[PDB]
Design a protein around this nucleic acid. Sequence first.
RNA 1: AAACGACUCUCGGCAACGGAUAUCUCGGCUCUCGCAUCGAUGAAGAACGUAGCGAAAUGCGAUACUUGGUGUGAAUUGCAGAAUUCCGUGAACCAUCGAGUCUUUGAACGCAAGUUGCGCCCGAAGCCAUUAGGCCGAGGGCACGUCUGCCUGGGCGUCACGC
RNA 2: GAUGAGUAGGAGGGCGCGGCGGUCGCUGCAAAACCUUGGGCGCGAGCCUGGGCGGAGCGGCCGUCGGUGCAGAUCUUGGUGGUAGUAGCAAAUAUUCAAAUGAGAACUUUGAAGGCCGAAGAGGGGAAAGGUUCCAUGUGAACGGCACUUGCACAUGGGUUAGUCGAUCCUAAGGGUCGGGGGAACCCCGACAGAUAGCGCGUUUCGCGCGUACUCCGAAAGGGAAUCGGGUUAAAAUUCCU
RNA 3: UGCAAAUCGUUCGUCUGACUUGGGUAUAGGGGCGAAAGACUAAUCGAACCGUCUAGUAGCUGGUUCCCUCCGAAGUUUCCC
RNA 4: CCCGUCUUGAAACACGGACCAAGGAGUCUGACAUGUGUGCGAGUCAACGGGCGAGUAAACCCGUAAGGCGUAAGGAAGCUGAUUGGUGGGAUCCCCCUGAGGGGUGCACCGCCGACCGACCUUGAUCUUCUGUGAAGGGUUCGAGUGUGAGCAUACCUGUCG
RNA 5: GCGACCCCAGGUCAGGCGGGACUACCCGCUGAGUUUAAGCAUAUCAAUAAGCGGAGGAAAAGAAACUUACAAGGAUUCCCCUAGUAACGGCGAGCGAACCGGGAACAGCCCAGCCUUAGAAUCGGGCGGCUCCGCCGUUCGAAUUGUAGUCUGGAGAAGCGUCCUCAGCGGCGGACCGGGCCCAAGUCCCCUGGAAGGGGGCGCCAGAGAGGGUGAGAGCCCCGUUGUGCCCGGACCCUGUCGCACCACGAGGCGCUGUCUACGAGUCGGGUUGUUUGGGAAUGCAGCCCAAAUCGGGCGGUGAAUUCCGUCCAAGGCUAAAUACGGGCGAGAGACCGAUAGCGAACAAGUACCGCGAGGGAAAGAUGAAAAGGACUUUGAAAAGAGAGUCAAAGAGUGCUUGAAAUUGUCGGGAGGGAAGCGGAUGGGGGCCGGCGAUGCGCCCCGGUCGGAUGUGGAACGGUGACGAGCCGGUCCGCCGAUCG
Lengths: 126, 253
Amino acid sequence: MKYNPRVSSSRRKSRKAHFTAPSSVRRVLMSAPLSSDLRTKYNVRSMPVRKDDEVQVVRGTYKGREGKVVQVYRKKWVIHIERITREKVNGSTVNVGIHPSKVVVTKLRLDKDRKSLLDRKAKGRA
Amino acid sequence: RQPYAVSKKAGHQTSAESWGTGRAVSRIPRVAGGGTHRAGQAAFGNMCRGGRMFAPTKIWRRWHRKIPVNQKRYAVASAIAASAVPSLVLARGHRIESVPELPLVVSDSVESIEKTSNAIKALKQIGAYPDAEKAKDSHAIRPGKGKMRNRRYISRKGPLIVYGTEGAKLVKAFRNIPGVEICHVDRLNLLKLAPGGHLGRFIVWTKSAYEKLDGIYGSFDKASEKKKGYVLPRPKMANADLARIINSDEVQS
RNA sequence: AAACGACUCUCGGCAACGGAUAUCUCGGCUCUCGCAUCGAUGAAGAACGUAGCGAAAUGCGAUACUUGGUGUGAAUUGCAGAAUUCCGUGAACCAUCGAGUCUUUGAACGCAAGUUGCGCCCGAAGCCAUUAGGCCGAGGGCACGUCUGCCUGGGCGUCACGC
RNA sequence: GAUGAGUAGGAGGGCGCGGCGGUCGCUGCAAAACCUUGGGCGCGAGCCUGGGCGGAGCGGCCGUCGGUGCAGAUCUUGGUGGUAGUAGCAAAUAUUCAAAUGAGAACUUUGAAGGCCGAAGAGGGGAAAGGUUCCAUGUGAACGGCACUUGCACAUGGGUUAGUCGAUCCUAAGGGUCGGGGGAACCCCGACAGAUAGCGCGUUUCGCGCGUACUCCGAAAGGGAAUCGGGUUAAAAUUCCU
RNA sequence: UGCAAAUCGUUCGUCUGACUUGGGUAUAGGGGCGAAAGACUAAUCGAACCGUCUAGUAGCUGGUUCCCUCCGAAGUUUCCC
RNA sequence: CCCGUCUUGAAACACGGACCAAGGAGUCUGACAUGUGUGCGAGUCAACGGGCGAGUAAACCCGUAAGGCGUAAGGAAGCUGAUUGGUGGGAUCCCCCUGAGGGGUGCACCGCCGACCGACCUUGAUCUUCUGUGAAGGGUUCGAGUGUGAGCAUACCUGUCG
RNA sequence: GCGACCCCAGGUCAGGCGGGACUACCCGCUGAGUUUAAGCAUAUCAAUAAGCGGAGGAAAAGAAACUUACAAGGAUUCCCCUAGUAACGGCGAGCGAACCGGGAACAGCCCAGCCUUAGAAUCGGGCGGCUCCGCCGUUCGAAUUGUAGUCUGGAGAAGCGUCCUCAGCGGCGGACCGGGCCCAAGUCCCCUGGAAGGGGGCGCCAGAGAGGGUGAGAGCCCCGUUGUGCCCGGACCCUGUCGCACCACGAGGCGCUGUCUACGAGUCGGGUUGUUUGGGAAUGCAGCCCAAAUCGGGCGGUGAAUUCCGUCCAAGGCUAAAUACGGGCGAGAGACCGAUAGCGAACAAGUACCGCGAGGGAAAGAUGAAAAGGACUUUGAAAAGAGAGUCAAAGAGUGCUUGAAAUUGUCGGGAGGGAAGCGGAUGGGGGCCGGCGAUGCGCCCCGGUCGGAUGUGGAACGGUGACGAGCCGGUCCGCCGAUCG
Ligand SMILES: [K+]
Ligand SMILES: [K+]
Ligand SMILES: [K+]
Ligand SMILES: [K+]
Ligand SMILES: [K+]
Ligand SMILES: [K+]
Ligand SMILES: [K+]
Ligand SMILES: [K+]
Ligand SMILES: [K+]
Ligand SMILES: [K+]
Ligand SMILES: [K+]
Ligand SMILES: [K+]
Ligand SMILES: [K+]
Ligand SMILES: [K+]
Ligand SMILES: [K+]
Ligand SMILES: [K+]
Ligand SMILES: [K+]
Ligand SMILES: [K+]
Ligand SMILES: [K+]
Ligand SMILES: [K+]
Ligand SMILES: [K+]
Ligand SMILES: [K+]
Ligand SMILES: [K+]
Ligand SMILES: [K+]
Ligand SMILES: [K+]
Ligand SMILES: [Mg+2]
Ligand SMILES: [Mg+2]
Ligand SMILES: [Mg+2]
Ligand SMILES: [Mg+2]
Ligand SMILES: [Mg+2]
Ligand SMILES: [Mg+2]
Ligand SMILES: [Mg+2]
Ligand SMILES: [Mg+2]
Ligand SMILES: [Mg+2]
Ligand SMILES: [Mg+2]
Ligand SMILES: [Mg+2]
Ligand SMILES: [Mg+2]
Ligand SMILES: [Mg+2]
Ligand SMILES: [Mg+2]
């Protein structure tokens, strides 16, 4: 049960906040869980999805497909993966949007900030 | 309740005037001007599109009620008495087939439970878990417009736990279990004792609260310590067993 | 010979016309709570501009859908192009604010106004001109009523000293 | 056992809609809603159900609440008929022939013929008013009350060049004001209750002499400094070129 | 149910003046303006137009939404601008 | 005979109605009143406020000589302030006898007549601060009074009124 | 002619101040009528709407020239009650306070005047310094037609005693506020589905089962939610502690006094007129006329005279809190509305559009999970049609969830001498209905399975009684007989 007086349980307000979120907030909202191996290694559960991250889809028609993320379309709330595509009536190839909550991160692109965030997340879990 | 009412100015934000008779149209006031779809249309009428409703709702409606304290106490005592009748508790929808006895009074050690898992284990031990499981399984989305009015989920009522020690940690341990409600013995609420106005709430008493009941509600002979001058009401019938009276030796002779 | 057909009407399937019904909702209405912050240091409002590709809405002011600091940490995206030591003074139609820019107006202030109309003053730099002045002009000034102080003045208004 | 009429009107018991507190359920093995010469229950309000469609929710029961039940109000908003392929297309004398283009020509363009406006015009320019309608190219739909290949429509581009033409300057009827006088105040009168703006001469920039309380707005027809030929564009010219 | 919320055809009055007309300017609602018709004052005039008081008041006109069941009238008395 | 309406009288040569969908009109509030349900009862009402408390607009608790209504009325007012009944019917119950009987009991309600309080009138021993008191005795007068309380809170329909 | 002062004039002189904007609340002015009175004029509407001004975060009011008559209360404000009362009113319609009493909050103060005269001890500006919201030095100016200091009626001045009280700085914390970072649990097995988030099974977290998103009802997929921990910044105010100097000249506190004791004028008050109020021989306010006093003045709800009594001290000023709040910025909620509803506006809505103008003012939301937004063939001038393709679905094809009625076309059935429709009764034709309409039961023979006492033991249990004894009793299990059902 919510107790903080500065947070609202209103459905309308929560929906408005989610659908008007700026890019910086959308990045956090577009988080995905880490794989079992990565979760065990880093002691972290979920991370924001990045461009060059390796991802395995776990839901939908592409449940077995995996690859490298190639675009994070925050405006559309979807990511794009290397070979997860389809053919139009024209015959050309287009990427299929996949929601990050429905995929699993198998390999992270590590930098100084990424390592700092991983350490910060692991510290709280202890 | 919180008051509701339409805007007092709604349907009157226009300078519309009636055309009068002689134009082969109704006498309802009509919007002035021209060059727009609104010009010439009716206004101010409860039967008019975009008009004011009949008898617009106002905030100074009598929302609240002032029931005499004695009647409130009567109702609370009646609900408490009904909670001790297993037939009534069953009739109210509670699964009490496994409870050792009614009223269900448990050891005061339950008041020191801190974790929800331990609370669940205690509920299983005392035989009240099936009611909580029934309450959890009934979780569903409320039908109708209420689901978009911030009342999205409804479910059945589980056991009500009454404790006698202020600041007991069981309140935190039990509050996350669906259907389970907790209340202090000194501030019992009729709304929880008779949900929906129906008697026979399933209640779990701690020993301390059960002991305090006598000092709170007194008795027929002496008065209550916590309710100044209050005495429990007496029924119009001393013995409600009608068969014992109708089939007695005195009557049947 | 009032049969077949046409017309009218009627009943049913299908197809039209129209947008009712049901299910929704980043909107409204109502109640409650917290705070006190516009303006001559030029407000509110009004005009005109500004994007690679925009008319409106939103934003902004010739530094013009943004400059700068800080936070966050890899986008924006309808299309095209360009960045980014992407293990980094570092992407973002991201967030937030301390630095900065902020056109014509408007209480609107040199005079006006159906006029980008009509005046006066100061002056950086530059041209040749030399203890002399000229051309040009960046840029800035010139409303009203008042308070304090000041400068310059008027009147036998009240006096005094001399002639 | 007896008995049965009912407008105005009163009351009782019930049916139906949407919420709230409870309770019992249904639903992607298909909810709501809607459709149906399928079937049944009730005197009735209504209710239950087959089949279809629809594709995400809904219902029963006990209490309780309400913006809760339509055939009418020349009722409101929206939608749709008969009228009806009907009334109408008729003022301003008038068109015809051949060719070109085009899928399509009575209506576009070229040529020829026959007519009209007849200089107080159906010609050639301006003022106000409009604001791109101006010019070139192209054109699906709409519009141009028949039609269009077309155009004052639509789409993409282009176009308005001044020392001499105007505004700008002056003042007209009048307008707006300082001070003063009124006014609770918004405001009223308007040079009328007043130390006016300033203007000339010589200069150590100071002196001398004049100085009747508005040096403001108000005319693209009143007054008024100055341009003419010749040529030039798809569209500008006393403005561009000489 | 017009080309037109005053127009069209023929006819008609006056036509150097109390003539006709453009622009500027002044007079604004119980006010203006009127060679005077209660005329005109933006298709509005015996008191314009716009917003508000305003959901103005009406003993008067019109409507007033489900079912069955039971009971079931009055147009007469007195008083009242 | 076409519905709705006004009407003594409508199928009317009486008005509205071309057709369909959706919307569309005795409500909310304040003061009273009868009725009914509920609590308590010579009382009743904690929600002005306070203590708290579902981490909480609820619920719970709190009336000191608080306050409202009731518990006493009659007079313009000064002011005074209920001596507590009788009787005819009458429900229920108890006795004797089985008659439409007799005796006892006599609530509710109704009829009749006293008594008490007060306005008014009348009356006057004794005391008394000299204007008060009140032994006795009253009245075709008047009251929304007394004669062993019946109210207060709250819910709803109906009715008058803003 | 010079000089001093006074009044005034000009300065683009040096440095400051003001105008205007917003509306929910707040302060001042001005000010109706509709309406009610069943007419209407006083009254009511209303000390309201409209109009003209002025502030803040609140405003305004505020420290008795009060309330009362008591055994007395004690600034202002607000709530309950007083009370629909006293009063007012063609005493009609109607209107209508205050004190006491109970609560919320509480807070008191500053001036003018006689009182330096051994010297204006006061203040502003320039300039120069400093630990710079200020202090110091110097110089000009203001001011004696009076700046400082003391005093304000509760007092106070002066005098004498008492020895009672009074003097900052800096550090570290707490309190308040605003922010930042991390931290629980499944996406395991099977099925239906385009997609599980649905059904079934097996697990887990919970001081987190508020809420939202993601391809359908998701506690454990994601954001969040609960509870800790850590980090940053304001407010210099309140509060605890610590380190150092802590000076009583002077000023206050208390007691005494054969002394003084200064207090607001065209103001109060009165007459009259107008307005307003419940204020009634006149409640307040305002114009005009008269016009005070200091052993006095105002009030004491009936005008006047006389004698007492009670209570305060006007005509100068400041002041937080309790209270108000349809505007501004920022939050939380709802038995509210759900696109003809709800604000006029869910959308480039105060927009398009209309009016010379003041002003008036709409309509308009829904493809799909994902554009995967329909390639290509063919006919056509083209719009498009016929095939084909995408999708779970086009029976979802960009005004794209669903798609009622009025109304219309087509096909099929039927009827029709100047309406049609309708009530009741049959009939013809059609349509529909198999709970539309049964096939069991009893007695015997054969075969197959399952069990068979009133006997004897065990397990648990019940009726009654007294949730004791005693009596009675059923279910299940194992055995010897019985040989039945
Ligand atoms: K048909
Ligand atoms: K920035
Ligand atoms: K000019
Ligand atoms: K239910
Ligand atoms: K059906
Ligand atoms: K209900
Ligand atoms: K062509
Ligand atoms: K003046
Ligand atoms: K003047
Ligand atoms: K001119
Ligand atoms: K030339
Ligand atoms: K008028
Ligand atoms: K009448
Ligand atoms: K009628
Ligand atoms: K008719
Ligand atoms: K009482
Ligand atoms: K009397
Ligand atoms: K000085
Ligand atoms: K002084
Ligand atoms: K004094
Ligand atoms: K005084
Ligand atoms: K006076
Ligand atoms: K006195
Ligand atoms: K609307
Ligand atoms: K569909
Ligand atoms: Mg709908
Ligand atoms: Mg409603
Ligand atoms: Mg001529
Ligand atoms: Mg052209
Ligand atoms: Mg002046
Ligand atoms: Mg001039
Ligand atoms: Mg009392
Ligand atoms: Mg104040
Ligand atoms: Mg009372
Ligand atoms: Mg008080
Ligand atoms: Mg100084
Ligand atoms: Mg679905
Ligand atoms: Mg999580
Ligand atoms: Mg139809």
